[PDB]
Curated annotation (Swiss-Prot), chain A:
Name used for this protein in its record: Checkpoint protein RAD24
Family statement drawn from the similarity comment of this UniProt entry: Belongs to the rad17/RAD24 family.
Main localization, broad class: nucleus
Molecular function terms from GO: ATP binding; chromatin binding; DNA clamp loader activity
Source organism per UniProt: Saccharomyces cerevisiae (strain ATCC 204508 / S288c)
Misc: Present with 752 molecules/cell in log phase SD medium.
Annotated ATP binding sites: 47-54
Gene Ontology cellular-component annotations: nucleus; Rad17 RFC-like complex
Swiss-Prot record, chain B:
Protein's name in the database: DNA damage checkpoint control protein MEC3
Assembly and interaction partners: Component of the checkpoint clamp complex composed of DDC1, MEC3 and RAD17. The interaction with MEC3 is performed in a RAD17-dependent manner. The checkpoint clamp complex loads onto DNA. Interacts with the DNA polymerase zeta subunit REV7. Also forms a heterotrimer with 2 RAD17 subunits. Interacts with SET1.
Main function: Component of the checkpoint clamp complex involved in the surveillance mechanism that allows the DNA repair pathways to act to restore the integrity of the DNA prior to DNA synthesis or separation of the replicated chromosomes. Associates with sites of DNA damage and modulates the MEC1 signaling pathway and the activation of RAD53 in response to DNA damage at phase G1. The complex also physically regulates DNA polymerase zeta-dependent mutagenesis by controlling the access of polymerase zeta to damaged DNA.
One Gene Ontology cellular component: checkpoint clamp complex
Originating species: Saccharomyces cerevisiae (strain ATCC 204508 / S288c) (Baker's yeast)
PANTHER family documented for this protein: CHECKPOINT PROTEIN, MITOTIC AND DNA DAMAGE CHECKPOINT PROTEIN HUS1
InterPro entries in the record: Hus1/Mec3 (IPR007150)
Family: Belongs to the MEC3 family.
Keywords for this protein: Cell cycle, DNA damage, DNA repair, DNA-binding, Nucleus, Phosphoprotein
Subcellular locations according to the entry: Nucleus
Something else known: Present with 414 molecules/cell in log phase SD medium.
Swiss-Prot record, chain C:
MF GO annotations: ATP binding; ATP hydrolysis activity; DNA binding
Primary subcellular site in the record, as a coarse category: nucleus
Subcellular localization, as worded in the UniProt entry: Nucleus
Organism of this sequence: Saccharomyces cerevisiae (strain ATCC 204508 / S288c)
Listed name of the protein: Replication factor C subunit 5
Function of the molecule: Component of ATP-dependent clamp loader (RFC and RFC-like) complexes for DNA clamps, such as the POL30/PCNA homotrimer and the checkpoint clamp DDC1:MEC3:RAD17 complex. During a clamp loading circle, the RFC:clamp complex binds to DNA and the recognition of the double-stranded/single-stranded junction stimulates ATP hydrolysis by RFC. The complex presumably provides bipartite ATP sites in which one subunit supplies a catalytic site for hydrolysis of ATP bound to the neighboring subunit. Dissociation of RFC from the clamp leaves the clamp encircling DNA.
Gene Ontology biological process terms from the UniProt entry: DNA damage checkpoint signaling; DNA repair; DNA-templated DNA replication; leading strand elongation; mitotic sister chromatid cohesion; sister chromatid cohesion
SMART domains, sorted: AAA
Curated annotation (Swiss-Prot), chain D:
GO cellular component assignments: checkpoint clamp complex; nucleus
Lineage, top ranks: Eukaryota, Fungi, Dikarya, Ascomycota, Saccharomycotina
Keyword Hydrolase assigned: yes
Residues of the full protein shown: 7 to 329 of 401
Resulting phenotype, residue 118 to K: In RAD17-1; UV-sensitive
Gene Ontology MF terms: damaged DNA binding; double-stranded DNA binding; nuclease activity
Single Gene Ontology BP annotation: double-strand break repair
Subcellular location field: Nucleus
The protein's name: DNA damage checkpoint control protein RAD17
Family: Belongs to the rad1 family.
Further remarks about this protein from its record: Present with 189 molecules/cell in log phase SD medium.
Main subcellular localisation: nucleus
Gene: RAD17
Record text on subunit structure and interactions: Component of the checkpoint clamp complex composed of DDC1, MEC3 and RAD17. The interaction with MEC3 is performed in a RAD17-dependent manner. The checkpoint clamp complex loads onto DNA. Interacts with the DNA polymerase zeta subunit REV7. 2 RAD17 subunits also form a heterotrimer with one MEC3 subunit.
Protein purpose: Component of the checkpoint clamp complex involved in the surveillance mechanism that allows the DNA repair pathways to act to restore the integrity of the DNA prior to DNA synthesis or separation of the replicated chromosomes. Associates with sites of DNA damage and modulates the MEC1 signaling pathway and the activation of RAD53 in response to DNA damage at phase G1. The complex also physically regulates DNA polymerase zeta-dependent mutagenesis by controlling the access of polymerase zeta to damaged DNA.
Length: 515, 293, 342, 288, 333
């Protein structure tokens, strides 16, 4: 009755289908996190389904927690030694007097106490309802508070996130990041991921060797029924098929059990694996080995990976990486045709068949010039995000310059003019005026009316650098926003003073607590 | 910088009620409030601009309320500006109110203390007894810079385009009737934007309207309404603002109303005190045109 | 202060170029009661905003030039915050809905309508900068707002191109063409500026070069004259080099690179320069136009190459107009030009 | 008055209490008002499966004038946005007057106090082609009829509402030696719960299970009616003010409830299409 | 308002009797004055053809000033017309009973038993919102009538076009609206040469609003001049923005002498003057098509070239690039 993937579970760390390097890295990181004052506070494990994240975490906990757990002096709840190596959060718990969004908080505020004599590894695999915006914000805030907390002691925190796609559903119309992919990036934020006290280790699909070994072990364990049903002599091939069909150990074991239990002969199938972004780009550019008909491959990709192929990110990636075919040494006519096709697809208002046309054109063009003697380049993510960030910084700087101009010279200009001519001419003029002001001041000191206009240039307010930086071609935002706010406040104060016409201060007069 | 205030609910109940009303009103509008402790009076400000749109509340309490009032600072007029969470002070004030209701003569002592255990951030050490159990509260607060305090200013209302309306005392024979008049519109579900109108020549009359493609609500007042020493003055305001005004009217006696046509609404409350007469504490509420004509 | 603004004329009579437009503005201001909605279209840098301000001054006195700034918050359908710096005066109002991108329609529905309903008896004047950048929905919403409340407000709009303006708006507005200043007028203005600034000059020909390097835009003319004067220690010589905007030089260098290397790797290298130019918030359309007309100035290319270049430029300009992302079309134009040149 | 229909009264509390029984029928629906010399009738229909009809008698109104001799009655329709709260209302007496002048004019309600004057106007709407009188009980064939106290029924309905009832079962049975059984069986997240009324006369007075004929009473046959609790809970407010409740089930499965408090409320609700086998088995087990 | 409103706003038709060139539909709208049988209406036509004025005058005639405010619900693009609005507000208004008319309006006005909903600029509504209006337009037709006004009939979904009687507002030219402009000029005491009004109508290209605005501008210029001289065609052309014939001749000469450098230089100089590409394209089309000095094949090619360039311009493209490409392409031919 018991399913094999549960019946044949690892009993020790040596039976986990995990590569040696990844296992060693996880061991080292987790051991470091268990130290009295550990630099790392959270272990973020991300990977596909059935890659043995929770399994390896539990197996390592079973060995590590007993080593560091401080001995008790009869303070255990029950006579038992409190076999609670791992404490996990349950997302479907509904207590009476508690709002739903506050559930995880109530867990975390308890988890902090599982240290020293009550040491326990905090595992977060069943996440709260992060699809709810408010719940996700609360979860992120709680994680940040844990990272920025100020307690001398905290228990190790492990978050295992199974990265998977969210199929396009009718009941959902929003198009946020989490609505497309359920991964660490969409669940967490930049601040948490980039925190110095958080360590992220990415898991990989289980390789064919480990899958074959474990499937062979499972088959050897069940020998009576396999021999009786006359499936032993042909077991190997089946295992091989599984080994080359899926990287999910649980799915592989389920498929093996389903095949073995069947009295007749049913075709062997496993769960489908989504094609990654770079894998999809490679399929579109260089083709697929498993298929020779391009039409069939493209139809399968569109039917199984419509969500990934519909976004403009895939089109931008194709535009960015189409030149890596032969390191760029291929006919320019093919590149022109590809780019023209992508441009014309851009005008089709994101219809699915526009994407079909673009991908099929790229595939046909690359197949036409395909040859055995080809050397490829490196695939890179398109840099549209960097351009957007630079544009945002430019907008902030232009707003700051406009505020300065308005509040110091009674001049209002369009942002278009700032982008076109002012953003280069004005900083240069201010810089040269400041240089001449320094020269004149030094000359006068050594020894204003002649160059009173130059004397009116203030170095602390007037912008003397090109907006957005120099154009380096052919030879973060919070700080700029705060600087703009400070300059705006200073300008307002100066304007008010003209109209009518400080922590050091607090430190100089400490409060007096006289009773 | 030294801050020390002593309050006794039993003595001068009227000013204690004034403080209760100010705290409740500020806590029922937003999350944080500005407290300016001056050598002469205490100002409590609830404004959107902190450290149509929502209205603003300004409460002035004379220094004579506090039995002990020690305010020392290095700034002009010994002004100390603070930003405090309304909920914490409101909870402390409920605790003190129930302690007094139980029956006691204890005094509430408020001091400003520095917190090295935790824009400097300090604490208010509100302490009072309860017959004995010592009640202490360290309410977090943020010290506000002189320039930032100067930024916040009282709104100014034109006095040539504005006409004042005197309301009957709550303790008078018409007080209950006028309170019911005010609350008439606080029992309709979908109503969110009421339309106040004032007509000159009962010397003056005040009406409340709600116009909709399906509904037409209209409430008249027939009692004697006086005008404080041309007949078309209308303003549309949210129901929350009217409810706040309703709650305010139930506490004070010399309540005054003003409608700046299609501009705003002003709700003034004063508390007379005998002695020349002592400084008159005030509560002024400004409401912006929710929709407008 | 910048010489562009500190010399800004503050009256219609002060204008010294395009006397016909000045006379037309005088005629319009002669009877400021039945002034229809105005739409001033003309090349950038001509002085359209200056002329609008001069007309407003001539009509409503000198309070218009006393500008004030305020912050007006906007809430969209999705409860999204929007901030538009409202430039207002006691006699007029100014707005640039283009800064709100595709949300400009809300400004048309929540700002213009509310103020139009309010009654001032005279009317208020509202200026919309960069009218051609308005989305079609905003232009459609403007129609009945203008027609119904013409008693209270009269609308003034400014643009560099009437092509993106829907037919109803052009029907509802009085069109005013603003010709750009000629070389001689720019030279005279620069001569006055240099004379008043006590700056030294050798020959008037330099000014002509300053007129040529700008070729109509007076703002850049004055900016670069100031830059040259300050760089040369307030001594403008005949051999003093002309300072151009950095992106212009970058585009010319990119054009030279395209001409020299017609290869895939050349396209890849040019992609980075295109990204940098876009990251400097330079519009895609102006990038395309400047690249096209820098390529058309190459002497090596023949008539057929130039004709193909202009054809591709027009096609990809249409694609940019109808497209969402701009990189595709710029890269396609460059690739097709390189293919034809090879 | 100079109007086709004009009524005035001082017992505003009774009218407000009676009108408060129309809240549970939603806020996006409409209310039909029938004006006649006999009095006022308020009709609501929901989902074409439940209907409520409240009658206000002439004697309740202090003064009544119906000058529309052309037609013996007038039909009008009003949207229930928040009309329930409007007619809700200190020491001084308040006079409530209703005015209506033919079709095309607003229904006007005016409250007169010592110093406060209220007037509210409601616009009328085209009478829905749907006939609210299509749902009625056939008197010829009544499966059973029961008389119950309002307080007990209100308590039972409140109990079902608390447990989040999803489906309701009305079970009626009459046996020998004066044995009467009336029960409500709720299917909810709790499973199956049962609330049975007592045989005491003070609570449960008098019962028949006719089996369909309204003439002969048989003993041993049980009548079971399956309802959606959404419709069944719309009579709880009407039952709160009830002084007596008359239940009637016909062979067709329509439930009729008469609520007597001189204001009478008649409610008709339909029965669900079919009964699942598990529900019937649980009913049998619970009643054994 | 006599001297404080724009001429277009001051001369808006008040009654159907003064609508100039829409008899084909104005007669139908008039004969239903006493019919109580007004159907759902879909007015479609180019800008400034007299669509809003017609419906406003019709409402005034049928209901009158007092009853108009209660029997008319007007929505336009400036108002938010989402699907929720169509479902709730429009449906509620349509289902409402017509307000009882007084004695005076009944005595003096027909007071039909139905109200009117005017969805001006309906072409800006989404397809789903239009769909939500289908059965509402039919269920409550006994007490409500719908009016949809648009410039692009294709933007209206087929079911609504089927549910509504369609009226096409024809373009107004010198042969359809000369009388109205002449009346306006006479009442404004505007002096002009013979044929000036015809030229203004032709420039308007089927938009009496543009003609009236141009006439107002010409009158203002003449008054400022104060010379007591009739306005000539040159002034109206200059204020309209039409490129002078001399510039067109020079452009044609440059195009004929095929030279990319000279053509591009002249195009840059011309476009540095602020002229609109649409006007010059229209003038070039007129000059080329009406000329008999060119072969049939050249006209066949140039027609498609001009059509493509005009379509590009309507999309909001750079006028300079498009004009240069057009001139070069014609030069090649
Ligand atoms: N040799 C093995 N190594 C690892 N897991 C095994 C092995 N044999 C059986 N299993 C089971 O296979 C399943 C997959 O391992 P898991 O760690 O649960 O997968 P996962 O990384 O957690 O992915 P998700 O998020 O749970 S779908 C578990 O239930 C294991 O108990
Ligand atoms: N048939 C007409 N008779 C008289 N004046 C007219 C006529 N058509 C237009 N006009 C004038 O031009 C103005 C245009 O007003 P409208 O009737 O709103 O134009 P329109 O047909 O609505 O154009 P669109 O489609 O809204 S851009 C009117 O106010 C009149 O002054
Ligand atoms: N007639 C004129 N005389 C002198 N300077 C002018 C004149 N017209 C414009 N300018 C100058 O040109 C500069 C920019 O003009 P701008 O208003 O930006 O034109 P546009 O509105 O077309 O962009 C102004 O700072 C102004 O000083
Ligand atoms: Mg797991
Ligand atoms: Mg119109």
């Amino acid at each position: 009755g018991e399913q094999w993937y549960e019946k044949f579970k690892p009993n020790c760390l040596e039976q986990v289908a995990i590569h040696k390097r990844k296992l060693k890295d996880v061991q080292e990181a987790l051991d470091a996190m268990f130290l009295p004052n550990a630099k790392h506070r959270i272990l973020l494990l991300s990977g596909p389904s059935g890659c043995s994240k929770s399994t390896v975490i539990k197996e390592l906990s079973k060995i590590l927690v007993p080593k560091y757990r401080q001995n008790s002096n009869g303070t255990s709840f029950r006579s038992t030694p409190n076999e609670h190596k791992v404490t996990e959060f349950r997302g479907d718990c509904i207590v009476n007097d508690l709002p739903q969004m506050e559930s995880f908080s109530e867990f975390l505020k308890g988890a902090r106490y599982l240290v020293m004599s009550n040491l326990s590894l905090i595992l977060i695999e069943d996440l709260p309802n992060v699809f709810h915006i408010d719940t996700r914000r609360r979860f992120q805030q709680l994680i940040l508070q844990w990272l920025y907390s100020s307690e001398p002691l905290l228990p190790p925190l492990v978050i295992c996130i199974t990265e998977c796609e969210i199929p396009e559903n009718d009941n959902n119309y929003r198009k946020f990041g989490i609505d497309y992919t359920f991964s660490a990036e969409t669940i967490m934020n930049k601040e948490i991921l980039m925190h110095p006290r958080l360590k992220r280790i990415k898991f990989n699909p289980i390789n064919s060797t480990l899958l074959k070994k474990h499937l062979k072990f499972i088959c050897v364990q069940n020998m009576k029924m396999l021999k009786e049903k006359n499936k032993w002599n042909k077991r190997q091939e089946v295992i091989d098929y599984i080994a080359q069909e899926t990287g999910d150990i649980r799915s592989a074991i389920t498929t093996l059990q389903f095949w073995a239990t069947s009295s007749g002969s049913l075709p062997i199938s496993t769960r489908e694996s989504t094609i990654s972004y770079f894998h999809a780009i490679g399929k579109v550019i260089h083709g697929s080995h498993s298929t020779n008909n391009d039409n069939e491959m493209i139809n399968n990709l569109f039917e199984n990976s419509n969500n990934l192929l519909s976004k403009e990110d895939f089109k931008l990636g194709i535009l960015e990486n189409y030149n890596t075919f032969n390191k760029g040494e291929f006919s320019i006519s093919d590149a022109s045709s590809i780019v023209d096709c992508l441009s014309e697809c851009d005008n089709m208002n994101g219809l699915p068949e526009s994407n079909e046309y673009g991908l099929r054109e790229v595939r046909k063009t690359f197949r036409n010039i395909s040859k055995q003697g080809h050397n490829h380049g490196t695939v890179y993510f398109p840099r549209e995000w960097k351009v957007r960030k630079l544009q945002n910084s430019f907008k902030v700087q232009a707003e700051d310059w406009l505020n300065v101009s308005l509040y110091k010279y009674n001049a209002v200009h369009s942002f278009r003019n700032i982008t076109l001519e002012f953003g280069y001419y004005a900083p240069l003029i201010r810089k040269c005026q400041s240089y001449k002001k320094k020269y004149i001041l030094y000359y006068l000191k050594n020894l204003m009316d002649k160059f009173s206009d130059i004397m009116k240039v203030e170095n602390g307010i007037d912008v003397v650098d090109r907006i957005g930086g120099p154009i380096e071609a052919l030879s973060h935002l919070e700080d700029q926003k705060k600087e703009r706010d400070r300059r705006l406040r200073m300008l307002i104060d100066q304007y008010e003073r003209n109209v009518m016409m400080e922590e050091t201060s607090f430190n100089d007069d400490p409060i007096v607590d006289s009773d | 910088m030294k801050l020390k205030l002593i309050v006794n609910g039993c003595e001068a109940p009227d000013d204690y009620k004034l403080l209760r009303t100010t705290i409740n009103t500020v806590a029922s509008l937003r999350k944080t409030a500005i407290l300016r402790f001056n050598s002469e009076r205490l100002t409590i400000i609830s404004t959107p601009k902190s450290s149509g749109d929502t209205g603003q509340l300004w409460c002035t309490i004379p220094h004579d309320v506090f039995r002990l009032y020690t305010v020392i600072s290095a700034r002009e007029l010994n002004t100390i500006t603070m930003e405090c969470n309304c909920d914490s002070l409101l909870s402390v004030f409920k605790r003190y109110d129930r302690v007094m209701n139980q029956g006691s003569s204890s005094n509430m002592t408020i001091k400003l203390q520095s917190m090295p255990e935790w824009n400097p951030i300090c604490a208010l050490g509100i302490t009072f007894e309860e017959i004995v159990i010592m009640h202490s509260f360290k309410v977090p607060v943020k010290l506000l810079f002189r320039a930032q305090d100067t930024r916040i200013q009282e709104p100014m209302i034109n006095y040539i385009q504005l006409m004042m309306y005197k309301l009957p005392p709550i303790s008078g024979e018409f007080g209950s009737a006028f309170h019911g008049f005010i609350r008439r519109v606080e029992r309709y579900s979908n109503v969110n934007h009421i339309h106040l109108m004032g007509v000159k020549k009962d010397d003056v009359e005040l009406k409340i309207i709600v116009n909709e493609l399906d509904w037409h609500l209209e409430i008249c007042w027939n009692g004697p309404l006086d005008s404080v020493i041309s007949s078309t003055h209308e303003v549309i305001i949210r129901c929350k603002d009217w409810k706040v005004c309703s709650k305010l009217y139930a506490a004070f006696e010399e309540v005054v109303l003003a409608i700046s046509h299609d501009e705003s609404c002003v709700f003034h409350c004063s508390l007379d005190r005998g002695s020349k007469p002592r400084e008159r504490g005030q509560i002024i509420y400004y409401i912006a045109r929710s929709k407008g004509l | 202060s910048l010489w562009v603004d500190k010399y800004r004329p503050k009256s219609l009579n002060a204008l010294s170029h395009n006397e016909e437009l000045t006379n037309f503005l005088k005629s319009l201001s002669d009877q400021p009661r039945d002034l229809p909605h105005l739409l001033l279209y003309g090349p950038n840098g001509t002085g359209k905003k200056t002329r609008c301000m001069a007309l407003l001054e001539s009509i409503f006195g000198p309070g218009v030039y006393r500008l004030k700034i305020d912050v007006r918050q906007f809430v969209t359908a999705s409860n999204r915050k929007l901030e538009l710096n409202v430039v207002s005066s006691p006699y007029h109002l100014e707005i640039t809905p283009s800064d709100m991108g595709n949300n400009d329609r809300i400004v048309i529905q929540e700002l213009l309508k509310e103020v139009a309903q309010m009654e001032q008896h005279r009317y208020k004047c509202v200026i919309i900068n960069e009218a051609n950048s308005l989305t079609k929905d905003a232009q459609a919403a403007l129609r009945r707002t203008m027609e119904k409340y013409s008693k209270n407000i009269r609308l003034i709009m400014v643009c560099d191109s009437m092509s993106p303006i829907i037919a109803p708006i052009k029907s509802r507005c009085l069109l005013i063409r603003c010709p750009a200043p000629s070389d001689s007028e720019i030279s005279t203005i620069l001569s006055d500026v240099v004379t008043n600034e006590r700056i030294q000059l050798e020959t008037k020909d330099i000014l002509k070069r300053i007129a040529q390097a700008s070729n109509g835009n007076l703002r850049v003319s004055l900016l670069m004259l100031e830059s040259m004067a300050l760089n040369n220690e307030l001594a403008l010589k005949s051999s003093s080099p002309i300072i151009k905007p950095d992106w212009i030089i970058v585009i010319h260098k990119l054009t030279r690179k395209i001409v020299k290397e017609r290869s895939v790797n050349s396209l890849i290298e040019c992609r980075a320069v295109l990204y940098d130019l876009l990251a400097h918030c330079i519009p895609a359309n102006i990038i395309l136009k400047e690249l096209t007309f820098s390529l058309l100035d190459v002497e090596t290319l023949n008539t057929t190459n130039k004709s193909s270049i202009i054809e591709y430029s027009s096609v990809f300009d249409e694609r940019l107009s109808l497209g969402n992302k701009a990189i595709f079309h710029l890269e396609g134009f460059i690739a097709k030009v390189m293919c034809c040149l090879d | 008055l100079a109007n086709k229909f004009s009524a005035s009264t001082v017992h505003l509390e009774h009218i407000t209490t009676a009108l408060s029984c129309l809240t549970p029928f939603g806020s996006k629906d409409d209310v039909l008002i029938f004006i006649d010399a006999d009095g006022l009738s308020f009709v609501r229909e929901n989902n074409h499966v439940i209907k409520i009809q409240l009658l206000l008698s002439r004697e309740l109104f202090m003064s009544y004038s119906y000058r529309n001799e052309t037609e013996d009655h007038m039909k009008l329709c009003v949207k229930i946005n928040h009309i329930l709260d409007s007619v809700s209302v200190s020491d001084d007496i308040v006079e409530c007057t209703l005015s209506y002048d033919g079709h095309g004019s607003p229904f006007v309600l005016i409250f007169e106090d010592s110093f406060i004057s209220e007037r509210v106007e409601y616009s009328t709407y085209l009478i829905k082609d749907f006939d609210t009188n299509g749902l009625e009980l056939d008197r010829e064939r009544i499966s059973f009829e029961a008389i119950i106290k309002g307080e007990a029924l209100h308590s039972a309905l409140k109990d079902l509402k608390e447990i989040g009832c999803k489906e309701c079962y009305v079970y009626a049975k009459t046996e020998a030696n004066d044995e009467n059984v009336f029960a409500l069986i709720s299917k909810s997240q709790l499973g199956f719960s049962k609330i049975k009324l007592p045989s005491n006369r003070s609570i449960l007075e008098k019962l028949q299970v006719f089996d369909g004929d309204s003439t002969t009473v048989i003993d041993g046959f049980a009548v079971i009616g399956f309802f959606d609790f959404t419709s069944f809970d719309k009579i709880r407010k009407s039952t709160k003010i009830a002084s007596k409740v008359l239940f009637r089930m016909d062979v067709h499965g329509v439930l009729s409830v008469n609520i007597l408090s001189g204001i009478v409320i008649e409610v008709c609700m339909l029965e669900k299409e079919s009964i699942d086998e598990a529900a019937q088995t649980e009913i049998e087990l619970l009643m054994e | 308002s006599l001297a404080q409103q724009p001429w277009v706003e001051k001369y808006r038709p008040k009654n159907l009797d003064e609508v100039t060139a829409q008899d084909h539909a104005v007669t139908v709208l008039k004969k239903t004055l006493k019919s109580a049988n007004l159907p759902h209406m879909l007015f479609y036509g180019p800008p400034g053809t007299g669509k809003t004025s017609t419906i406003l005058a019709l409402t005034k005639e049928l209901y009158g000033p007092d009853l108009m405010k209660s029997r008319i619900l007007e929505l336009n693009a400036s108002d938010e017309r989402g699907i929720s609005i169509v479902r709730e507000k429009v449906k509620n208004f349509a289902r409402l009973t017509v307000s009882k008319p007084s004695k005076h309006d009944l005595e003096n006005y027909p007071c039909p038993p139905y109200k009117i909903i005017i969805l001006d600029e309906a072409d800006s509504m989404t397809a789903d919102a239009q769909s939500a209006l289908r059965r509402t337009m039919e269920t409550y037709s006994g007490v409500t009538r719908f009016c949809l006004i648009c410039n692009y009939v294709t933007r209206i979904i087929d079911p609504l076009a089927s549910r509504c009687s369609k009226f096409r507002f024809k373009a107004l030219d010198a042969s359809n609206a000369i009388d109205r402009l002449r009346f306006i000029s006479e009442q404004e005491n505007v002096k002009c040469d013979d044929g000036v009004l015809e030229r203004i109508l032709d420039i308007s290209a089927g938009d009496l609003r543009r003609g009236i605005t141009l006439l107002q501008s010409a009158s203002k210029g003449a008054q400022y001049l104060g010379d007591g001289k009739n306005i000539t065609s040159t002034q109206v052309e200059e204020l309209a923005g039409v490129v002078p014939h001399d510039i067109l001749i020079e452009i044609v000469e440059k195009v004929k002498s095929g030279d990319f450098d000279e053509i591009k230089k002249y195009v840059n100089t011309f476009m540095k003057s602020g002229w609109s590409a649409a006007s010059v394209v229209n003038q070039l089309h007129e000059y080329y098509i009406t000329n008999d000095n060119f072969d049939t094949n050249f006209k066949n090619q140039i027609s498609w070239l001009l059509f493509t360039t005009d379509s590009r311009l309507n999309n909001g493209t750079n006028e300079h690039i498009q004009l240069l490409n057009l001139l070069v392409k014609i030069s090649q031919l």
